[PDB]
């Protein structure tokens, strides 16, 4: 048919864009290669986070700092956790399916799509035209270029979350947050974990205090780390042995029962034949867009993980809505990602919003930093867990908050406030003027703001 | 020609805050403490209640959780260990509070009970002391109700219960406030049948209806017994193993218990002060009256903290202490701004309020517009498999500015801080929709609540 807007994808960006597009009264189509919903609902956020909740519960049941308690944690039936998880993602995706019946405008086309023309695509054999296109194809697990991994029984973020047999030992190869979250997940479920990465600092992109802190907590909990490693080759023997490579000038090997690969996530632009539609691709295989989400083709827009931006679901939905506003309705709204929060749901949780110290220096600010150890926050003390940090990056001249970086329990709830401070230009003085609830983690912010001479 | 520049009666949050801010001005100050240094929050109040609450939450999650594959269990609790460890923690913490005894080498710790004998002098331990300025940060103490028989009875208070080292098989709580809820749920999670009794027909009468209904639903779901709308007539005791209660809704009923906790209120400690000898006004509820600057009827006597029967929180006490010091020392005529005070009831689910309720905003004259979001709509609550709560949003229909936020959810005390920033600095619901919210966090609820306006 001659659609008004054709969407390649079914993720958060595809859904936000489809809704906002039907609001304008346009006939739209949703082309999905596989299972509807995208990554976050089925193989991404939701499963990881619910399983992480279970793991945190059993971890507190097995080892807690309070003496009088007589708690214990037995062996885990992972099959049950995974089946219940799948029931939850199915229920949730079903709560997302209210958009097929309702919004009775858009048409669900199932199949792999490829571009054949500047205005038409081909899927499952048939051709489809449209006045506007949205490429919200997302990203998929990326692989490293290390010997032996080719023919090997390795797991990815998606495959590990299907495993129904707890490995006695799991090795993670990844510098990102997914490797940490899944690693700690299986450590709390009863498994000796070994994190391996080439970067010499845990979470290389964060501030030094954050890396040192989260690393200290991870080592304290019992996760083994292998930093600064140079990966040469990996081998497998009878599905009951693994391998590793040199580190710090000494050839070492790490045998494991399972191997997880968390290198990165590559955009799914290969099968699109973007060159047949005049859509430029970047050095990292992404899709290039302008401030309005428009590609080199005037009537093809892109949003989500496929555009190498902050690979988060909320950014994907935001970008979808804005892009739709630009393509349909003409409203020239720019994509504002100047303040995007990031949460690594380990315990202690890592959380960032705004600029780091090095980033604020690069931007040209006259930076003033204040670092507060978690043992200074009352809530961390009464909880008898004080491994963390609150970092505050401000402008020494105007006192405006440029960035907040936290390592503490449920820090994902605190950085929202920090976001409000950064976006709306609140000063540290403002943070001291506001009353903070005693024995909450948010109090950390105030206590960090009370660190300027 | 006097003994001190500023003399403080008390050692609580207000006393220390005022001492710090006063030494900053370079003034000779004194701290008169009747008993144990640190005040209520460190020794008998916040810190103990919340650390024990943390333990109780841990054991409760160990005994009952919604995730199937987990095989966790929780045995009988050794309360003695929890209480001794608690005391070790408050000792460590008060010891960290002593850093002000040397870092701020100005103030002098005088120990003894003080009473006023003149408009400008006090008496402690026999000796008299003059000062150009006075701060009455005497705090509050557990109050008792007017019900027959409780006078001669082995009842517990907020301070005594935190010392109990034997888990009662059944504990009855008499209180409409948050302390009763916190301690009640604490001992419920420690393995004890709890029964909350109050005269108000709605849990937390001052909060919004949805908040009361929700938190009540969670308490009943957990297994806490509630007795609302009760008229308290008499209570009896027999051999330290039996208790009593009174009629409710027109049917005389009785609640037998192994222990009885009283959380009615907290009376200011103004009796032993002889304020009438210094010309300091007291209110109908035995409090100390102050103006907008914290100044009493006596020009050179200020007051701050719980004795000033205002929002009875430690952060409000410290704030009031600092401001009062600014007024008395330094002359700066700064008013006490309590227009945005957060409140947290650290039960699970946690209750959290900041700003105006719906009825309060209507009374103030606003054209109110509310948005209520059930907790089962928040992703983080869903993945956690605990969805008993609510997000209520009170806004101004004209300017869309956020007037108040009220939440019932896990660790909601961390979220309302954001809400505070929204209320204090006049952010609109549209502003909350413009901001990107982290997925699978409870703070996201705020955004989801802002996305409910037609
Ligand atoms: C383990 C894990 C944890 C994560 N945790 C978080 C988190 O905590 N917070 C967070 O914000 N983000 C998280 N993410 C990332 C998040 O899932 C993504 O940022 C988000 O889903 C992006 O949405 P999207 O629409 O852009 O792409 P996607 O949601 O991935 O959707 C892509 C869809 O496009 C389809 N498709 C692909 N190629 C084609 C083609 N050629 N033709 C037709 N259809 C095609 C696919 O079948 C898929 O359904 C996580 C990811 C993983 C793997
Ligand atoms: C169980 C419980 C839990 C609580 N939880 C919280 C919470 O979570 N958050 C929160 O914000 N607040 C909480 N509070 C309240 C909080 O502790 C108080 O509001 C706060 O301590 C008030 O500080 P203050 O200095 O005004 O009074 P206080 O801290 O009580 O200080 C009073 C001091 O004055 C001294 N004094 C009294 N009379 C005399 C006299 N005649 N002469 C000399 N000295 C005298 C006493 O020795 C005492 O040390 C809680 C209270 C209780 C009981």
What assembly state would you assign to the polypeptide chains in this entry?
Answer: homodimer
Q: Mind telling me which CATH architecture of the largest domain in chain A this is?
A: 3-Layer(bba) Sandwich
The computed structural class of chain A is alpha/beta
Which cofactors or ions or other ligands sit in this model? flavin-adenine dinucleotide
**Beta strands of chain A, count:** 20
Q: Count the DSSP helices of chain A.
A: 14
- Integer-rounded radius of gyration of chain A: 24 Å
State the major sheet of chain A. Answer: 7 strands, mixed
CATH topology label of the largest domain in chain A: FAD/NAD(P)-binding domain
Task: Provide an overview of this structure.
It is classed as oxidoreductase. The entry lists the keywords Mercuric reductase, merA, FAD, oxidoreductase. It forms a dimeric assembly. The entry is titled "Structure of mercuric reductase from Lysinibacillus sphaericus". Chains A, B: Mercuric reductase. The structure is a homodimer. In chain A, helix 1 runs parallel beside helix 9 (313-327), helix 3 (45-62) packs antiparallel against helix 4 and helix 3 (45-62) packs across helix 7 (177-188). In chain A, strands 1, 2, 4, 5, 6, 7 and 15 form a seven-stranded mixed β-sheet that branches. Helices cover 30% and strands 21% of the residues of chain A. Chain A starts with a strand and ends with a helix. The first copy, chain A, has three domains: 1-141 and 264-338, 3-Layer(bba) Sandwich (FAD/NAD(P)-binding domain); 142-263, FAD/NAD(P)-binding domain, CATH 3.50.50.60; 339-453, Enolase-like, domain 1, CATH 3.30.390.30. In chain A, strand 19 (389-395) and strand 20 (401-408) form a beta hairpin. The longest helix of chain A is centred in the first third of the chain and has 19 residues, at 78-96. Chain A is α/β, with parallel strands linked by helices. Chain A has helices at residues 12-23, 39-42, 45-62, 78-96, 98-101, 157-160, 177-188, 208-221, 313-327, 357-363, 378-382, 414-423, 428-433, 443-449, and strands at residues 2-8, 28-32, 71-73, 107-110, 113-115, 120-123, 126-135, 139-142, 155-156, 169-173, 192-196, 224-226, 258-261, 264-267, 300-302, 342-344, 349-354, 367-373, 389-395, 401-408. Strand 3 (71-73) of chain A pairs antiparallel with strand 3 of chain B. The structure holds flavin-adenine dinucleotide (2 copies).
């Amino acid at each position: 048919d001659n659609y008004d807007l054709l969407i390649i994808g079914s993720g958060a960006a595809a859904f936000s864009s489809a809704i906002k597009a039907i609001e304008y009264g346009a006939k739209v189509g949703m082309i999905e290669r596989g299972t509807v919903g995208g990554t976050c609902v089925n193989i991404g956020c939701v499963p990881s986070k619910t399983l992480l909740r279970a793991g945190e519960i059993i971890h507190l049941s097995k080892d807690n700092p309070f003496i009088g308690l007589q708690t214990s944690a037995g062996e885990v039936d992972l099959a049950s956790l995974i089946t219940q998880k799948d029931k939850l993602v199915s229920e949730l995706r079903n709560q997302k399916y209210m958009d097929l019946i309702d919004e009775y405008n858009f048409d669900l086309i199932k199949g792999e799509a490829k571009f054949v023309d500047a205005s038409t695509v081909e899927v499952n054999g048939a051709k489809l035209s449209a006045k506007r296109f949205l490429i919200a194809t997302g990203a998929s697990p990326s692989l490293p270029q290390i010997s032996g991994l080719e023919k090997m029984d390795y797991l990815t973020s998606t495959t590990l979350l299907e495993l129904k047999k707890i490995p006695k030992r799991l090795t993670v190869i990844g510098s990102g947050y997914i490797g940490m979250e899944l690693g700690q997940l299986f450590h709390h479920l009863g498994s000796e974990i070994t994190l391996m990465q080439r970067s010499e600092r845990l979470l290389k992109e964060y501030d030094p205090e954050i890396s040192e802190s989260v690393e200290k907590a991870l080592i304290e909990q019992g996760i083994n780390l292998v930093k600064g490693a140079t990966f040469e080759r990996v081998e497998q023997s009878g599905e009951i042995k693994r391998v590793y490579v040199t580190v710090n000038g000494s050839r070492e090997v790490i045998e494991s029962d399972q191997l997880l690969v968390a290198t990165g996530r590559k955009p799914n632009t290969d099968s699109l034949n973007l060159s047949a539609a005049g859509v430029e691709t970047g050095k990292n295989n992404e899709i290039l867009i302008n401030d309005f989400g428009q590609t080199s083709n005037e009537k093809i827009y892109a949003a989500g993980d496929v555009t190498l931006g902050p690979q988060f679901v909320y950014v994907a939905a935001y970008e979808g809505g804005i892009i739709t506003d630009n393509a349909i309705g003409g409203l020239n709204k720019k994509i504002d990602l100047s303040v995007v929060p990031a949460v690594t749901f380990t315990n202690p949780t890592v959380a960032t919003v705004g600029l780091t110290e090095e980033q604020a220096k690069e931007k040209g600010y006259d930076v003033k930093t204040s670092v507060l150890p978690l043992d200074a926050v009352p809530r961390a003390i009464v909880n008898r867990e004080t491994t963390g940090v609150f970092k505050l990056v401000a402008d020494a001249e105007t006192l405006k908050v440029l960035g907040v970086h936290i390592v503490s329990e449920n820090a994902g709830d605190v950085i929202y406030a920090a976001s409000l401070a950064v976006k709306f230009g609140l000063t540290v003085e403002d943070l001291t003027e506001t009353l903070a609830p005693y024995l909450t983690m948010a109090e950390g912010l105030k206590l960090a703001a009370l660190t300027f001479d």
